[PDB]
Paper text:
TPADO is an α3β3-nonheme RO, which catalyzes the NADH-dependent dioxygenation of TPA, the aromatic subunit of PET. Residues H210, H215, and D356 coordinate the ferrous ion in the active site, which is 12.2 Å away from the [2Fe-2S] cluster of a neighboring α-subunit and connected via the amino acid side chains H210, D207, and H105.
To understand the structural arbiters of substrate recognition, we determined the crystal structures of TPADO in the ligand-free state to 2.28 Å resolution and ligand-bound structures with TPA to 2.08-Å resolution and 2-OH-TPA to 1.95 Å resolution. The substrate was located next to the mononuclear iron in an orientation confirmed by clear unbiased Fo–Fc difference electron density. One of the carboxylate groups from the bound TPA forms a salt bridge with R309, positioning the adjacent ring carbons 3.9 to 4.1 Å away from the reactive iron in an orientation that could promote reaction with an activated Fe/O2 species. The side chain of I290 forms a hydrophobic π-interaction with the aromatic ring of TPA, while the second carboxylate group forms a hydrogen bond with S243. Additionally, a potential salt bridge between R390 and this carboxylate is observed, but the distance varies among the α-subunits between 2.9 and 4.6 Å. After crystal soaking with substrates TPA or 2-OH-TPA, the formerly disordered helix residues are ordered but partially unfolded, thereby allowing H215 to coordinate the ferrous ion. Here, we observed an unexpectedly large change in the conformation of a helix containing two Fe-ligating histidine residues in response to substrate binding, consistent with the role of the substrate in permitting binding and reductive activation of O2.
Author numbering:
A (entry chain A), B (entry chain C), C (entry chain B): 1 to 154
D (entry chain H): 1 to 129
E (entry chain F): 4 to 221, 227 to 247, 269 to 413
F (entry chain D): 3 to 222, 227 to 246, 270 to 411
G (entry chain E): 3 to 253, 269 to 426
Write the structure that this text describes.
Amino acid sequence: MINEIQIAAFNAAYAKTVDSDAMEQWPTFFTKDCHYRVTNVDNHAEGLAAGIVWADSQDMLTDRISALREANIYERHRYRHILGLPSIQSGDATQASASTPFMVLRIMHTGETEVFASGEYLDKFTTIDGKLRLQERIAVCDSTVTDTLMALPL
Amino acid sequence: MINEIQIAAFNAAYAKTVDSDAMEQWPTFFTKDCHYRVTNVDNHAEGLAAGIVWADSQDMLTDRISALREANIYERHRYRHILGLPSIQSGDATQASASTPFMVLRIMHTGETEVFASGEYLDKFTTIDGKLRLQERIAVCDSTVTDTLMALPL
Amino acid sequence: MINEIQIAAFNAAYAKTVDSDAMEQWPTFFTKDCHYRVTNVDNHAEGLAAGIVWADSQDMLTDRISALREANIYERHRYRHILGLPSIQSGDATQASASTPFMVLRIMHTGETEVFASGEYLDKFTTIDGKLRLQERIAVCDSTVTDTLMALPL
Amino acid sequence: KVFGRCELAAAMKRHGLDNYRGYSLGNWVCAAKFESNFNTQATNRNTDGSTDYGILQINSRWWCNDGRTPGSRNLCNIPCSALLSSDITASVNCAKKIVSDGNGMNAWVAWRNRCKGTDVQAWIRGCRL
Amino acid sequence: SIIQWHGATNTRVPFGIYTDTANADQEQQRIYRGEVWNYLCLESEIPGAGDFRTTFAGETPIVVVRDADQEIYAFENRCAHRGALIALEKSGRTDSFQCVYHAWSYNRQGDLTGVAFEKGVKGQGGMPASFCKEEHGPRKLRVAVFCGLVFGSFSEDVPSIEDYLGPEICERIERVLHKPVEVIGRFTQKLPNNWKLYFENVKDSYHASLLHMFFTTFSQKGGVIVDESGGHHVSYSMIRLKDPSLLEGFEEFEDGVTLQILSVFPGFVLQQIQNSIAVRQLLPKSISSSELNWTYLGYADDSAEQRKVRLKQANLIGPAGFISMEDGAVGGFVQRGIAGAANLDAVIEMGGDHEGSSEGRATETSVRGFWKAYRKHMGQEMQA
Amino acid sequence: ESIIQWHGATNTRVPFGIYTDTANADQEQQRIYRGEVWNYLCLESEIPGAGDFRTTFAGETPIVVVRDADQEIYAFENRCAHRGALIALEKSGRTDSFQCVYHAWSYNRQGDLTGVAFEKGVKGQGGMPASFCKEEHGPRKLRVAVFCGLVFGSFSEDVPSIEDYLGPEICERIERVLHKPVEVIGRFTQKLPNNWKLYFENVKDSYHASLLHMFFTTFESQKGGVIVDESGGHHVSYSMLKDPSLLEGFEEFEDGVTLQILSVFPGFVLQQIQNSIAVRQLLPKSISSSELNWTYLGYADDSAEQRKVRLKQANLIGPAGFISMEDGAVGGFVQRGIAGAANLDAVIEMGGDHEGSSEGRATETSVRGFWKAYRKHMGQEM
Amino acid sequence: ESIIQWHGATNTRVPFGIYTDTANADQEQQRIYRGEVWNYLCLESEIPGAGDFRTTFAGETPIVVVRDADQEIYAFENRCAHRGALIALEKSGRTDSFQCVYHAWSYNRQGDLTGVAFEKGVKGQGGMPASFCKEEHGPRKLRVAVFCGLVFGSFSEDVPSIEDYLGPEICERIERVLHKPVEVIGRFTQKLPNNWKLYFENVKDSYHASLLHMFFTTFELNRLSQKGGVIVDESGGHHVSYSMIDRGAKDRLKDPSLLEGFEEFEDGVTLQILSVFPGFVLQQIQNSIAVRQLLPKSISSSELNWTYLGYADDSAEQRKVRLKQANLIGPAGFISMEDGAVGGFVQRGIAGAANLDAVIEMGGDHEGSSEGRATETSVRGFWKAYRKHMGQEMQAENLYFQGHHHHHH
Ligand SMILES: O=C(O)c1ccc(C(=O)O)cc1
Ligand SMILES: O=C(O)c1ccc(C(=O)O)cc1
Ligand SMILES: O=C(O)c1ccc(C(=O)O)cc1
Ligand code: FES
Ligand code: FES
Ligand code: FES
Ligand SMILES: [Fe+3]
Ligand SMILES: [Fe+3]
């Protein structure tokens, strides 16, 4: 039985991982055959499938973090995730769908703090071998606008 | 006893309703003879009674959403509520008096995200048919300033 | 064991005390021999000890609030703390080490709302007479930049 | 959780189900008895893609969202998993909505077959209420 | 030039007038610090000796204060030393004003009464023998009061408040403010438009019916009055919902006038809509932003039942008003619609090229009036 | 001593002032965006039915683009002819006619004034003078051209046809990618912290492609080239892990060409990077900010498996692109690196002082081309 | 209609326009920050090893400062000579050479262009023309001076030596504090809602400082007689404000340890604030040592970068004294807190008064050293130095209008 307490604890550990630059641990929050996407309300309302990030495997998440470390040029910055309470939309004895509101601050190494993104995580959760895991996370951003670029996943 | 978890769950369903533009459902969070008001710390400290929104019935709330749909002209935008944990001042198995911190982002259809309001809900809760209901919600805004207009209630 | 729910309840009472300008009650959240510091990620990463605020006793916190009331000049403003869920790193029935994400809005008396600080509290909690108390709170700010000045502690 | 008969009577009375839309407490206890056998985890897969969930066997096409039922209307606006807990709150609040839908307790087939116009107040005797 | 007028008449307004920054600084010199009366506050907000508020006349911060003679004084909120704000609070009560930077003291008139270390410290430093306090001070304002309204001017030449308003505006103010009023709430709207677009909107009798849609979605005669200068107007009107009590009201005016909106150049509004009374103060902030400060009003003599009627009817007005909500946004729609059209002209021809009073409200006469008064103050008038 | 003084007839030197002078930016609105250019508005497939409209910009100027019952597409300035309010407030919709919310003036889909509220007064009184004639008031209409589904608009009666403006070589290079019906698969906007020109130069910068982007070098000099049209304004640049499927593709172009970037002065990009297709629209917003609007494309005939390849390869592009992430930041690196250097000059000497086509990509010929077209529009020649 | 018109030769009157005129701000970048001044960059101990660099600003202009294998420190404009990109994107690091990310041009630690990607073309196509010569392209280099560990840079090769620029008295006052190795104990930035000049005037404002100090002795927290003074160099640009006890004269807080301190200077000086035109501050307040760097950001905003200091030889107990006394300084300082806000009070108070003048008459019209601190001599000094660099002394027509006469001598 997945409940709001397990998902809140999970969401806090996910936020801590992404905000601390322990990005190597981010893929472990997902199943092998997961989906992750960053999109916006317009795309989601029209049923448009593309994401500024789009992954249908945990390996694609690991590649995205490799590229972030070793390949991509971006000005140093950090995220601060402030999350709402998860609300479970659907569930049975073993699976659950949930929505979690988020806000992400971007803090540049030079000190500027901006509201960088906000929206909801539309999630499909499962429990394998005692581990709560995302089968799916769609970060539906409220805004169609990304300021400058997006290096770190939401 | 009504506790901080039940009030937070209530507050999250209220926020989800207002942030999804399911505005027709907003009045069902209140009793028939409810009070709802949007005010600011200056008015609240001086004991000034007026609100940007002022309602002493659920019917007044319903009419405000009718007017928003059929009558009012405003540029498309959405809210993103980020809520704090409530503090309960008094209450029992049926009633509670509580204060809940809030922040509201406004996101224009054109992509701009701003902190549009912040403050606390000063609430009186009752129980109808085993469900929490607002007898009273006073949205005390930290700022005396509303950017442009206020179409959606807080 | 001290848990995430007790720490979240404590953090909400701490935030409400600071955001209501009941600053006289802020030192009571701390042990007599506490440490409190406001610093930033660069200082914390390099191991630099100095704080914008630096206190190694409850008495130093009380003096800082005296000076705020009876000595300091600053333009009237308030804070709005929005907190995340805490993570416990280690602890037992009486001690715990814990991290809590935060954002602080500053609202000027003239109406401007800004993200003033964000980061995490790096906390050491103890239990005195059955009640949670901070042995240590380090407010590690995401930004090296403070807009104008800092009058109220984080 | 397997409830005791009287344990469940007290719990249903505390969530205001004595005489809720004309139905005495015994009807609700009798209903849970023949729907779920007082089992909060009872589940019954139907051949139409829907499943009945919990102590009062509430259906995933009309009432709760289980995420695998085509045409889900979710009129109680909850996930079906909320109807599989130890605490009967979500099942009571949903039941109050169902019993108000216009067909009273006839929604519940087992209640209709085994309880309706019996000595339903036998299901609450020997209990502290 | 994007501020070139195309004729003596005001049926054409150059869109450049809403974006030219040099012209905005001229507005501060020739309007806000020129021959106008700037709305400061109500007498009931500063009832007792020492009570003060801070506010603005255009860009210029102002202190307004009641002294022991029961008179009201106003001066520029600028220390005559190195220019710091003197009063840092929105409101309060004080014997005297003190700049926090180097402790220069001012009386309630704005006179320099004290200079810290004027005579030096231990007989070293301080001011030279030639320094005289009485020769240094913020600019003082002329203050005028009218039925509880407090106005300030920088100009020695501005007419009396009665002559500036003229008879018809004087009578229409007195009709509403005939007995003591009480603030029942304050709210500010930050408008994403040049100030003028909001002031035009207040005077826009044409839009009031079409933009709003509230009474028409869910007969009586009206008119527009314009003073001799063009700067001031009155728009008036005279004889579905699950909770009709929103619009339940009571008689309290001698006439049958159910709506009266009144403007005083360059930023004062007095509104009466049924039993909903308020004042607005419009301030310029930047070329494309302004501030609208609402003061909602009861009468000090209101019963609980009358006051409740005003608290319900307030839903019509303000930032979320069933009527006024759109007023906060239409300015910005103009500001943005003209982004590529700084060299083009607004068309204001409804009701002719008149800047005088009219029966009916399907006219822009009070909008043309605003531009007549604006061009006079700004030295932009062309001859017929 | 002007910060926009050009130092010669050729474009091997660009005055850094050109990226910060506000008077010069307003001249760009008069002489480029409302001058003799074609502005990219949207795809015809985004407004397929009668009444379908979108709102967008040509430079700073808001635009409505709309399909009429004749199946033709019209465009006009989103400015009411009364007092200047935006007419259409929605990003998109479907409508019979446009109505200004301020005083209920009505426009048809061509942008003609069809109705003025209380034109003839109310009861006896007010309304317009006898001399007022609706037909003499209206927003500026745009000339519309459609090329392979691309909807362009111009303020200019004198701009050549879209075919002549593009020239044959750009026409054929657009046709090559937009040869069959396309489908929008997603929209995203990037807000760039730079003057628009720094991004348009970046798109044309064949020199940077392999050096800024370690993905372009690490997992890919190859056969390729740079094409510049006769005006200089338009270019083509062309070229031929635990989950390798990020870069797994399928053949679908006749030539061997695995990369084709195409630019059309002053702000249109069509990209083909393997199976990743997209359109970009570049808009100026302020002297040091611009907007890049991405329209991701599939072909209507894609299988599930082809569409999935494009959704995976889209990780290369856009705001989080393994390639294009850097393109969002490099403009700002320039905007900031020149903060003390308004009086100095960019050095653009790679491949000579040529503004023609080249068989290598170690050249800045397409960047010089941009400045040739810019100076002609702006009256800054020699 | 000029809002930057000086009233005369004297600095007792400052045109408020000087704080809002944007044309004049650009002139400050050409004539001050890239003129004959020394810009504070960092401490040598912050880039101790070969390859260690920091990025910073001289005015609006981004700078790289770097240690080389010769143990010398170099500085150059952080601007690629190709298309103008920032070269170094990190606040600090260690590198062999600096490479621009845009087209891979390489620079050594002096700022010389050492490499141009595809300079010679590919397969005999493209690259640079024959005429292109790397040694003719490069960011502007700075002349570097290190004085008691303080690294300054100038864009001008004709700037006086750091010793002549400071003068003897300021040199000794720096040496007094930076007499032995220092350690950074923290960094903090304040974003000030004011023109840079209002903050630099505030550093030099002995009038405000002595008023505020006299208030803090209301609390009776020391109780020992003090004398103060102000030192101004010959140019006006640099000051020292001090307070001292006379060693060997005769005769509230729940944790008094905030103000418990220890003797560590061979003098009675309890407070010394030292300014170096146009944006350097060195402070000693009891045992609280710090450096400040002031940078212009926009016409009405500036940045103050604090570097807090201990001495490398501090014991645990001496370092703790400095960590407690740091509560007096910085963004939340018992003393400095209001320093962040008074500039903005002026910026706003003058909103309608661009055509009016500040009055700076305290201590007369002199720009020299003084006994006591109830003077604005060091503020007038700043304006003397400012007008010299800016070419705003009485010139030509107005000098002629005053002097076109023949008085009886
Ligand atoms: O701005 C306003 O609230 C306002 C302006 C005019 C009218 C009118 O002419 O009826 C009503 C209200
Ligand atoms: O904007 C882009 O994606 C891009 C621009 C230029 C090139 C090139 O010329 O090789 C490749 C990619
Ligand atoms: O900017 C400061 O902190 C400061 C400036 C001057 C003095 C002094 O003159 O005593 C003290 C402190
Ligand atoms: S600025 Fe007011 S006393 Fe100095
Ligand atoms: S501005 Fe459009 S109808 Fe008036
Ligand atoms: S801008 Fe630095 S190499 Fe091109
Ligand atoms: Fe109106
Ligand atoms: Fe690129």
